[PDB]
Amino acid sequence: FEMARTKKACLIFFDEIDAIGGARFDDGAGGDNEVQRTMLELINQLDGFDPRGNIKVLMATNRPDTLDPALMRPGRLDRKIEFSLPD
């Protein structure tokens, strides 16, 4: 996001965001704690204390049920476009 902000307008594509966008949980041990922090950083840059900039993000996932509620919130993923099977 630092390098995306060095541009007047930018597009970031997050293909297969379910790799890091999984929902936070506590399984006793530190299960997926590190990856959750990466997701927490991505959430912070999208909508945090600082303005994001002219970045318009775009994420694709075939497992949207696994994404964290904070990432699936407007202001981070405002539009939820569903690619259902064609009619």
Residue in 9, 15, 51, 82 binding other proteins, rule: CB under 8 A: 82
Q: How many helices (H) and strands (E) does the chain have?
A: 2, 2
Q: Cα(80)–Cα(49) distance, rounded to whole angstroms? A: 24
15 in contact with other proteins (CB under 8 A):
no
From the list 8-16, 52-60, 64-72, the region that binds other proteins by CB under 8 A is 64-72
Site residues for other proteins, 16-45, by CB under 8 A, read 24-30, 33-34, 37
| CB-nearer residue toward other proteins: 7 or 33 | 33
- For residue 46, the tally of other CB atoms under 10 A from its CB is 20
